Design a protein around this ligand. Structure first.
Ligand code: NA
Length: 347
DNA sequence: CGCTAGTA
DNA sequence: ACTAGCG
């Protein structure tokens, strides 16, 4: 994600307990719990041997949330964006490669190194997430599978006012324009909260505390949608954005070599990549649980043609998007693997 | 030396 | 998180 974003806006953080959100609703990036839970199932998941410990982990955190009168909303990732469509495949190659090395170093007899081999092949499927959805539904906890990246969905839930805060371990949520983000939360409730309005407390940020400029800075620093230019981190991006005055971000990027006193000429693909990154942060498709339909994260502005934003997610029928959101329809095979109906969050 | 990027 | 390497 955004490289060390937390350390740059340290002064906008505040240590809290989840009791602060008693009688309210918060959205949870369930992946951060699912992963940690799946760590203790490394050899079991790699062996193909059944296990339900990550379920108990996620439900430990969820029950911890419920104990303080909080209404948690578990949000999961859905279809992979066309941008990261290949990087995922690479990660899969490395996955089953380390699975190969794992099963080979297991059969060798030395299971000592298998604790480094089998754990490098852990892969969060959608059946595991679905198990978590079942367990959470057996407690009255609403779930929501994002059409694509969970970050966008969470950001929408927070922006709309459906949830008041977001529990996650990813700093990219701030780039999506979230208001309140709860980070580093443990199994008790202790975590660092970062509020958007508090962004101005950071002196090293300058006038780059507004949503748009902050986003531009996060992108220029280096994100998952676009790698940063050589020698360009958070400090550099914040610097050039502070020294910039021209509303046209394209001209600023083209003149990045002037403001930083560096020898940096912008590749043609970097400009387009920046435009696509910005448009991905702005208009990635999310699921509106109230209207039960597929909408962009933000409403399209005046100078944007939605026909060009296929990389930000493809549109499908609202019924199918609903079946995906409920976790009924499989992400890959589009088969009906469940039959849940919220009429027998989705009010 | 402030800052980045690779290592842990 | 620690720090060599470099503007
Ligand atoms: Na960078």
């Amino acid at each position: 994600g955004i490289q060390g974003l937390l350390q740059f806006i340290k002064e906008a953080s505040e240590p809290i307990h989840v009791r602060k959100y008693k009688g309210q609703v918060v959205a949870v990036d369930t992946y951060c719990w699912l992963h940690k839970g799946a760590i203790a199932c490394a050899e079991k998941l790699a062996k193909g041997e059944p296990t339900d410990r990550y379920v108990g982990f996620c439900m430990k955190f969820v029950n911890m949330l419920l104990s303080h009168g909080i209404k948690p909303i578990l949000v999961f990732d859905g279809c992979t964006l066309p941008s990261k469509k290949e990087v995922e495949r690479s990660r899969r190659e490395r996955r089953q490669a380390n699975l190969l090395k794992g099963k080979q170093l297991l059969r060798e007899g030395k299971v000592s190194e298998a604790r480094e081999c089998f754990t490098r092949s852990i892969n969060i499927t959608h059946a595991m997430a679905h198990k978590v959805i079942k367990a959470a539904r057996s407690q009255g906890v609403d779930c929501l599978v994002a059409p694509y990246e969970a970050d966008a969905q969470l950001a929408y839930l927070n922006k709309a006012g459906i949830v008041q805060a977001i529990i996650t371990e990813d700093s990219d949520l701030l780039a999506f324009g979230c208001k309140k983000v709860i980070l580093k939360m443990d199994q008790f409730g202790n975590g660092l909260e970062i509020d958007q309005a508090r962004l101005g407390m950071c002196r090293q940020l300058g006038d780059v505390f507004t949503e748009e400029k902050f986003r531009y800075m996060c992108i220029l620093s280096g994100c998952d949608y676009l790698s940063s230019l050589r020698g360009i981190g958070l400090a550099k991006a914040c610097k050039v954005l502070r020294l910039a005055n021209n509303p046209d971000i394209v001209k600023v990027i083209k003149k990045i070599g002037h403001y930083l006193k560096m020898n940096i000429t912008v590749p043609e693909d970097y400009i387009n990549g920046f435009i696509r990154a910005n448009n991905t942060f702005l208009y990635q498709l999310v699921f509106d649980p109230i209207k039960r339909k597929l909408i962009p994260l933000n409403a399209y502005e005046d100078d944007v043609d939605p026909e060009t934003l296929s990389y930000a997610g493809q549109y499908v029928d609202d019924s199918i998007a609903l079946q995906i959101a409920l976790g009924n329809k499989d992400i890959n095979t589009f088969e009906q693997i469940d039959d849940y109906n919220p009429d027998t969050l989705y009010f």
